[PDB]
Design an enzyme around this catalytic site. Structure first.
Site, PDB file in Angstrom:
ATOM      1  N   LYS A 105      34.729  28.460  32.536  1.00  0.00           N
ATOM      2  CA  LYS A 105      35.841  27.547  32.631  1.00  0.00           C
ATOM      3  C   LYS A 105      35.647  26.717  33.879  1.00  0.00           C
ATOM      4  CE  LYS A 105      40.762  27.282  33.477  1.00  0.00           C
ATOM      5  NZ  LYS A 105      41.613  27.937  34.516  1.00  0.00           N
ATOM      6  N   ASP A 106      34.658  27.068  34.694  1.00  0.00           N
ATOM      7  CA  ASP A 106      34.332  26.229  35.847  1.00  0.00           C
ATOM      8  C   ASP A 106      33.245  25.237  35.490  1.00  0.00           C
ATOM      9  OD1 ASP A 106      36.117  26.995  37.655  1.00  0.00           O
ATOM     10  OD2 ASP A 106      34.721  27.992  38.975  1.00  0.00           O
ATOM     11  N   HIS A 146      39.864  35.823  49.442  1.00  0.00           N
ATOM     12  CA  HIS A 146      39.492  37.022  48.716  1.00  0.00           C
ATOM     13  C   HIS A 146      40.290  38.233  49.150  1.00  0.00           C
ATOM     14  CE1 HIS A 146      35.611  35.750  46.525  1.00  0.00           C
ATOM     15  NE2 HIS A 146      36.264  34.663  46.872  1.00  0.00           N
ATOM     16  N   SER A 178      43.766  35.418  43.896  1.00  0.00           N
ATOM     17  CA  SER A 178      44.408  34.158  43.586  1.00  0.00           C
ATOM     18  C   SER A 178      45.868  34.231  43.162  1.00  0.00           C
ATOM     19  CB  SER A 178      43.593  33.426  42.522  1.00  0.00           C
ATOM     20  OG  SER A 178      42.701  32.469  43.107  1.00  0.00           O
ATOM     21  N   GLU A 208      40.181   2.706  53.261  1.00  0.00           N
ATOM     22  CA  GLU A 208      39.903   3.055  51.856  1.00  0.00           C
ATOM     23  C   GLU A 208      41.168   3.646  51.204  1.00  0.00           C
ATOM     24  OE1 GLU A 208      36.417   1.913  49.903  1.00  0.00           O
ATOM     25  OE2 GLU A 208      37.612   3.636  49.220  1.00  0.00           O
TER      26      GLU A 208
HETATM   27  C1  HEM Z   1      36.717  21.612  51.878  1.00  0.00           C
HETATM   28  C2  HEM Z   1      37.812  21.332  50.862  1.00  0.00           C
HETATM   29  C3  HEM Z   1      38.307  22.579  50.121  1.00  0.00           C
HETATM   30  C4  HEM Z   1      37.566  23.425  49.405  1.00  0.00           C
HETATM   31  C5  HEM Z   1      36.065  23.341  49.214  1.00  0.00           C
HETATM   32  C6  HEM Z   1      38.351  24.377  48.900  1.00  0.00           C
HETATM   33  C7  HEM Z   1      37.820  25.459  48.054  1.00  0.00           C
HETATM   34  C8  HEM Z   1      38.869  26.315  47.418  1.00  0.00           C
HETATM   35  C9  HEM Z   1      38.520  27.234  46.308  1.00  0.00           C
HETATM   36  C10 HEM Z   1      37.185  27.432  45.678  1.00  0.00           C
HETATM   37  C11 HEM Z   1      39.753  27.895  45.927  1.00  0.00           C
HETATM   38  C12 HEM Z   1      39.915  28.914  44.831  1.00  0.00           C
HETATM   39  C13 HEM Z   1      39.945  28.180  43.498  1.00  0.00           C
HETATM   40  C14 HEM Z   1      41.243  27.420  43.366  1.00  0.00           C
HETATM   41  O1  HEM Z   1      42.324  27.947  43.590  1.00  0.00           O
HETATM   42  O2  HEM Z   1      41.217  26.266  43.030  1.00  0.00           O
HETATM   43  C15 HEM Z   1      40.784  27.360  46.831  1.00  0.00           C
HETATM   44  C16 HEM Z   1      42.170  27.850  46.749  1.00  0.00           C
HETATM   45  C17 HEM Z   1      43.068  27.450  47.865  1.00  0.00           C
HETATM   46  N1  HEM Z   1      42.826  26.518  48.892  1.00  0.00           N
HETATM   47 FE1  HEM Z   1      41.227  25.403  49.164  1.00  0.00          FE
HETATM   48  N2  HEM Z   1      39.700  24.122  49.226  1.00  0.00           N
HETATM   49  C18 HEM Z   1      39.576  22.985  50.072  1.00  0.00           C
HETATM   50  C19 HEM Z   1      40.680  22.225  50.720  1.00  0.00           C
HETATM   51  C20 HEM Z   1      41.960  22.989  50.789  1.00  0.00           C
HETATM   52  C21 HEM Z   1      43.105  22.393  51.111  1.00  0.00           C
HETATM   53  C22 HEM Z   1      43.267  20.905  51.381  1.00  0.00           C
HETATM   54  C23 HEM Z   1      44.053  23.306  51.135  1.00  0.00           C
HETATM   55  C24 HEM Z   1      45.500  23.090  51.433  1.00  0.00           C
HETATM   56  C25 HEM Z   1      45.630  22.406  52.784  1.00  0.00           C
HETATM   57  C26 HEM Z   1      43.542  24.472  50.829  1.00  0.00           C
HETATM   58  C27 HEM Z   1      44.373  25.712  50.817  1.00  0.00           C
HETATM   59  C28 HEM Z   1      44.036  26.526  49.619  1.00  0.00           C
HETATM   60  C29 HEM Z   1      44.844  27.460  49.120  1.00  0.00           C
HETATM   61  C30 HEM Z   1      46.204  27.801  49.684  1.00  0.00           C
HETATM   62  C31 HEM Z   1      44.257  28.020  48.058  1.00  0.00           C
HETATM   63  C32 HEM Z   1      44.838  29.113  47.189  1.00  0.00           C
HETATM   64  C33 HEM Z   1      45.140  28.547  45.801  1.00  0.00           C
HETATM   65  C34 HEM Z   1      45.803  29.564  44.897  1.00  0.00           C
HETATM   66  O3  HEM Z   1      45.741  30.731  45.167  1.00  0.00           O
HETATM   67  O4  HEM Z   1      46.406  29.218  43.888  1.00  0.00           O
HETATM   68  N3  HEM Z   1      42.123  24.400  50.640  1.00  0.00           N
HETATM   69  N4  HEM Z   1      40.195  26.465  47.649  1.00  0.00           N
HETATM   70  C1  LIG Z   2      25.908  27.291  45.766  1.00  0.00           C
HETATM   71  C2  LIG Z   2      26.758  27.650  44.540  1.00  0.00           C
HETATM   72  C3  LIG Z   2      27.104  29.143  44.497  1.00  0.00           C
HETATM   73  C4  LIG Z   2      28.613  29.386  44.639  1.00  0.00           C
HETATM   74  C5  LIG Z   2      29.017  30.030  45.983  1.00  0.00           C
HETATM   75  C6  LIG Z   2      29.920  29.079  46.784  1.00  0.00           C
HETATM   76  C7  LIG Z   2      31.227  28.714  45.994  1.00  0.00           C
HETATM   77  C8  LIG Z   2      31.903  29.991  45.635  1.00  0.00           C
HETATM   78  O1  LIG Z   2      32.364  30.833  46.371  1.00  0.00           O
HETATM   79  O2  LIG Z   2      31.936  30.119  44.252  1.00  0.00           O
HETATM   80  C9  LIG Z   2      33.198  30.575  43.602  1.00  0.00           C
HETATM   81  C10 LIG Z   2      33.062  30.095  42.156  1.00  0.00           C
HETATM   82  C11 LIG Z   2      34.391  29.989  44.474  1.00  0.00           C
HETATM   83  N1  LIG Z   2      35.645  30.126  43.714  1.00  0.00           N
HETATM   84  C12 LIG Z   2      35.967  29.545  42.569  1.00  0.00           C
HETATM   85  O3  LIG Z   2      35.287  28.664  42.074  1.00  0.00           O
HETATM   86  C13 LIG Z   2      37.176  29.903  41.798  1.00  0.00           C
HETATM   87  C14 LIG Z   2      38.113  30.853  42.141  1.00  0.00           C
HETATM   88  C15 LIG Z   2      39.214  31.061  41.297  1.00  0.00           C
HETATM   89  C16 LIG Z   2      39.393  30.341  40.105  1.00  0.00           C
HETATM   90  C17 LIG Z   2      38.472  29.363  39.734  1.00  0.00           C
HETATM   91  N2  LIG Z   2      38.472  28.563  38.637  1.00  0.00           N
HETATM   92  C18 LIG Z   2      39.463  28.574  37.611  1.00  0.00           C
HETATM   93  O4  LIG Z   2      40.378  29.337  37.702  1.00  0.00           O
HETATM   94  C19 LIG Z   2      37.356  29.140  40.580  1.00  0.00           C
HETATM   95  O5  LIG Z   2      36.568  28.276  40.226  1.00  0.00           O
HETATM   96  C20 LIG Z   2      34.198  28.486  44.588  1.00  0.00           C
HETATM   97  O6  LIG Z   2      34.002  27.697  43.692  1.00  0.00           O
HETATM   98  O7  LIG Z   2      34.144  28.141  45.892  1.00  0.00           O
HETATM   99  C21 LIG Z   2      33.189  26.995  46.184  1.00  0.00           C
HETATM  100  C22 LIG Z   2      33.880  25.999  47.108  1.00  0.00           C
HETATM  101  C23 LIG Z   2      32.125  27.919  46.992  1.00  0.00           C
HETATM  102  O8  LIG Z   2      31.172  26.851  47.403  1.00  0.00           O
HETATM  103  C24 LIG Z   2      31.009  26.943  48.824  1.00  0.00           C
HETATM  104  O9  LIG Z   2      31.568  27.861  49.407  1.00  0.00           O
HETATM  105  C25 LIG Z   2      30.161  25.947  49.540  1.00  0.00           C
HETATM  106  C26 LIG Z   2      30.400  26.144  51.034  1.00  0.00           C
HETATM  107  C27 LIG Z   2      28.701  26.188  49.121  1.00  0.00           C
END
Ligand code: HEM
Ligand SMILES: CCCCCC[C@H]1C(=O)O[C@H](C)[C@H](NC(=O)c2cccc(NC=O)c2O)C(=O)O[C@@H](C)[C@@H]1OC(=O)C(C)C
Ligand code: HEM
Lengths: 89, 378, 53, 89, 105, 48, 60
Positions: free
Chosen positions: B226-227, B200, B204, B270
């Site tokens: 869209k989510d 944040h 993004s 796996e």
């Molecule tokens: C516990 C597994 C993970 C969760 C729950 C998680 C959750 C998220 C979420 C909600 C976003 C913003 C939405 C999106 O861009 O899709 C994000 C973006 C990102 N995550 Fe993760 N992610 C996880 C694993 C990773 C991994 C494997 C990496 C890379 C090693 C990573 C590095 C990033 C980066 C760099 C972004 C920025 C994406 C962008 O700005 O385009 N995170 N993640």
């Molecule tokens: C309990 C549900 C309330 C939501 C609060 C927690 C969840 C939360 O923080 O919500 C927002 C939705 C967070 N970001 C996005 O989704 C998101 C961000 C940029 C773009 C897109 N999509 C398409 O462009 C996205 O979808 C996201 O999706 O992160 C999850 C991993 C997180 O979830 C977590 O933390 C877990 C540790 C709970």
């Protein structure tokens, strides 16, 4: 209602404002609506009429928004649209 | 005044998915962040319902799972959603990291790095996960792997037996793994929030790598719906498995209990560790094999130090775009080899794929980058 | 000491939200019913008898 | 030519209203109107039918961003009924 | 001036068209990664350039969202591609390097 | 081995049948909201 | 004579009350009718059930 009565009476003060109301009203209403009639129209109005009349024009209606200036924080049209109804009601 | 903004709690929620400005620009490759979130909770959620019926104890381990599948009202869907959700959690994890490299997202150091920490932990978790039912794959899967720490000079032995609770895998090892498989996803869940916290700070990245400040849209409508759609798609897939092809991605032999006497010439971790598996044994070394296995994943944390290009996304970079896909296909290769026995063709080709992997990420992509600079006159 | 809210306006405010508060209980009853498959109440609804002959 | 044609098109008696307010007597006004205004629609037009077609309203939005202005103006509206509707009051 | 210099120019014109930003109306400099140096040069642009750069990038981000591109006759023609940010970027780098150099003694 | 076998597929039918109404719907919903963005028109009007 | 969708909006969709009331009222009847038609479709394409098997064992 009182505000509006005040407004009306206050606005019709002097030759010009009156003359303009005559001419314009003839164009729009076809006649001249005597103060008394407006007073009667206003008196008729009460809470219910307001809610009913407001809902008719504002409730869940589509707005026309116009913006100018440093408007980066002006909410998105969807958001403004959503603000035109209440989930409680 | 709008309570949605000044209340200590909502603030967080407003900042998370209501008022947060996002690129008008992101595409489907950005959904896997919600999907990973969803995955994480659904996993935590079915996982818990299995724990109200599961056991531990080597004697009852296998028995309890079958108990669930057959006796526990609806225990089967729960069990299979858990096991299939686990695979989906990898498909997304994989896709997420993919999206990341292509688009240059890794330039957010802290965020990327927390994500690597998020990768190792869900890997470490899912590993312990499959040891639980106490099947054949569970036993030697739990053996072939863990051992690796025995390649560590001077103290390898000590550690592998310390993680074991004995001299082999038994009593001490199943209860251990269950407990760890229980506490990890909570810890992960925390780390995720910190991941998201650091995210944040910059907002993004987007398909162009340019900078969308000039055109941000509110998360409200837009990315919430869209989510949702997106999550529905993830449900379709998870349900397709569970309800039509429950064991398609599952090794049929984790059925039939354990047996420290056997070992069924085949055995592979796996699917989601196949590429890694291939790497390790594509090296005639105990130390080198495991050393190479580690580098295979810990190299992600190296990527940013080899960004060489003057552009951020690969959206306008044909040369690198080619090396990206060569990487993917090559990983699909490693996955395939990993799935095969250590014999004739399979050896040398999986040995080439390994070298390719490391040479591609360490030399090829960084050079493709510089040439593109030079081509553009940058 | 909830006397601050005792007056003509409050009485009008209260009355305005009567239909809403009512319909909002209709939503919850039916909602509770449908969710727990309330054997008692449902038997009465014409269709929805998935427990008859 | 553009002008005179709009003039003759629109400045026709049945669409004009001589109005006045103050120290006059209505008869004196009528006399004048008949003296200086007689002969404007001594020709009621053939097929020039100045009729207003209703106007569509559009839930829409126009944003003229300009961060160089110090303050922003916003104007939001909903479709109103029009001059003659009693809902105005 | 060579027959082969046109070849290098030809390989470059080739990459340009391949790189593709021109279909989105961008200019080469509209696509640079923003870093400190790049941010400072963006700061130094005169109003019109800055405004034009903003409009461009807005137009692309917009296209990119609809996943469309501009009609072909409106793509940025290589060679009509103005390197409007290089001189500033170059100057910002020079001064940084002077600093970097002063910090050594 | 798989007693649940028939129920599994019975639900599977509903899962397909449900998603068959939902996927299009939850998709038409997202369109609605994004349509404001999709047909938006830009104009650049610099001074002079 | 307006439109179905029009008349539908006025009487039930306008107020979030009736709007929500409509869907909880509409979900009850849907769960029932969709479960009927669905299972029926599931049986019609089968018939190696334990349904048609019973006719044989009303005794013991
Ligand atoms: C516990 C597994 C993970 C969760 C729950 C998680 C959750 C998220 C979420 C909600 C976003 C913003 C939405 C999106 O861009 O899709 C994000 C973006 C990102 N995550 Fe993760 N992610 C996880 C694993 C990773 C991994 C494997 C990496 C890379 C090693 C990573 C590095 C990033 C980066 C760099 C972004 C920025 C994406 C962008 O700005 O385009 N995170 N993640
Ligand atoms: C309990 C549900 C309330 C939501 C609060 C927690 C969840 C939360 O923080 O919500 C927002 C939705 C967070 N970001 C996005 O989704 C998101 C961000 C940029 C773009 C897109 N999509 C398409 O462009 C996205 O979808 C996201 O999706 O992160 C999850 C991993 C997180 O979830 C977590 O933390 C877990 C540790 C709970
Ligand atoms: C803390 C919430 C979790 C709990 C309570 C939990 C508990 C369990 C239990 C008791 C089992 C054995 C029953 C069975 O095999 O079906 C199991 C299996 C498994 N779970 Fe979890 N787990 C949780 C989170 C996770 C996570 C985060 C993952 C990683 C996606 C995961 C992936 C697995 C795997 C791979 C298995 C074994 C595979 C299989 O079922 O064949 N679970 N879990």
């Amino acid at each position: 209602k009182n505000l509006l009565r005040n407004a009306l009476v206050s606005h019709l003060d002097g030759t010009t404002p009156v003359c303009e109301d005559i001419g314009r009203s003839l164009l729009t209403y076809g006649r001249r609506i005597p103060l008394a009639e407006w007073e009667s129209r206003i008196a008729e109005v009460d809470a219910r009429v307001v809610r009913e009349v407001c809902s008719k024009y504002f409730y869940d209606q589509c707005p026309a928004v116009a913006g100018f200036g440093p408007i980066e924080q002006l909410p998105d049209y969807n958001r403004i649209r959503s603000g035109m109804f209440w989930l409680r009601f | 005044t709008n309570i949605r903004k000044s209340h200590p709690l909502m603030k967080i929620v407003n900042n998370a998915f209501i008022d947060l400005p996002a690129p008008s620009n992101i595409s489907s490759w950005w959904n896997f962040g919600s999907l990973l979130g969803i995955c994480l909770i659904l996993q935590i959620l079915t996982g818990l319902f299995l724990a109200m019926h599961y056991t531990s104890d080597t004697t009852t381990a296998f028995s309890s799972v079958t108990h669930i599948c057959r006796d526990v009202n609806y225990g089967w869907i729960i069990r299979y959603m858990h096991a299939n959700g686990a695979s989906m959690f990898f498909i997304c994890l994989y896709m997420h990291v993919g999206r990341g490299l292509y688009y240059g997202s890794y330039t957010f150091l802290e965020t990327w790095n927390i994500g690597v920490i998020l990768l190792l932990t869900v890997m470490a978790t899912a590993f312990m996960g499959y040891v639980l039912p106490w099947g054949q794959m569970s036993f030697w899967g739990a053996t072939v792997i863990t051992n690796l720490l025995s390649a560590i000079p001077y103290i390898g032995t000590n550690l592998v037996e310390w993680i074991w609770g004995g001299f082999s895998v038994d009593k001490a090892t199943l209860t251990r793994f269950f407990a760890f498989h229980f506490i990890l996803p909570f810890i992960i869940m925390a780390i995720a929030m910190v991941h998201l916290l650091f995210l944040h700070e910059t907002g993004s990245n987007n398909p162009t790598g340019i900078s969308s400040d000039v055109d941000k849209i509110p998360f409200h409508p837009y990315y919430t719906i869209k989510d949702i759609l997106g999550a529905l798609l993830l449900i379709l897939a998870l349900m397709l498995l569970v309800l039509f092809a429950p064991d398609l991605l599952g090794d049929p032999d984790n059925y039939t209990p354990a047996n420290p006497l056997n070992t069924p010439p085949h055995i592979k971790p796996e699917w989601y560790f196949l590429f890694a598996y291939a790497i390790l044994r594509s090296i005639p070394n105990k130390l080198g094999g495991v050393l190479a296995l580690a580098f295979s994943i810990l190299i992600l944390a190296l990527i940013p130090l080899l960004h060489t290009s003057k552009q951020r996304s690969m959206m306008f970079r044909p040369l690198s775009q080619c090396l990206f896909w060569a990487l993917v296909a090559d990983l699909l290769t490693l996955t395939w080899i990993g799935g095969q026995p250590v014999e004739h063709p399979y050896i040398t080709i999986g040995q080439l794929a390994s070298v390719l992997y490391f040479l591609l990420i360490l030399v090829l992509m960084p050079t493709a980058g510089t040439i593109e600079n030079k081509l553009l006159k940058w | 000491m909830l006397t601050r809210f005792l007056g003509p306006r409050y009485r009008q405010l209260a009355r305005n939200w009567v239909p809403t508060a009512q319909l909002w209980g209709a939503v919850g009853a039916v909602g509770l019913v449908w969710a727990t498959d309330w054997r008692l109440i449902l038997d009465w609804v014409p269709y929805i008898n998935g427990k008859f002959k | 030519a553009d002008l005179t044609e709009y003039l003759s098109r629109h400045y026709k008696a049945p669409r004009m209203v001589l109005a006045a307010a103050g120290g006059l007597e209505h008869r004196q006004l009528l006399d004048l109107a008949q003296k200086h205004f007689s002969g404007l629609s001594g020709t009621y037009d053939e097929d020039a039918v100045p009729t207003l077609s209703p106007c569509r309203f559009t839930g829409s939005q126009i944003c003229h961003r300009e961060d160089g202005l110090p303050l922003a103006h916003v104007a939001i509206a909903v479709e109103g009924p029009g001059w003659a509707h009693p809902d105005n009051v | 001036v060579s027959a082969s210099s046109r070849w290098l120019e030809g390989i470059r014109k080739w990459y340009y068209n391949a790189a593709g930003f021109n279909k989105l109306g961008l200019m080469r400099d509209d696509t640079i990664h923003e870093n400190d140096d790049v941010k400072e040069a963006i700061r130094r642009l005169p109003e019109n350039l800055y405004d034009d750069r903003v409009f461009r990038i807005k137009r692309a981000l917009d296209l990119s969202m609809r996943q469309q591109i501009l009609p072909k006759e409106q793509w940025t023609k290589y060679e009509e591609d103005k390197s409007y940010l290089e001189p500033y970027l170059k100057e910002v780098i020079r001064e940084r390097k002077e600093r970097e150099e002063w910090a050594k003694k | 081995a798989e007693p649940e076998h028939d129920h599994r597929k019975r639900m599977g039918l509903k899962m397909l049948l449900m998603m068959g109404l939902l996927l299009p719907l939850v998709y038409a919903m997202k369109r609605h909201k994004w349509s404001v963005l999709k047909s938006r028109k830009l104009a650049y009007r610099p001074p002079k | 004579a307006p439109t179905l969708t029009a008349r539908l909006y006025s009487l039930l969709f306008r107020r979030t009350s009736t709007f929500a009331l409509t869907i909880v009222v509409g979900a009850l009847f849907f769960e029932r009718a969709f479960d009927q038609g669905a299972d029926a479709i599931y049986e019609h394409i089968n018939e190696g059930k334990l349904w048609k098997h019973i006719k044989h064992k009303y005794e013991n």
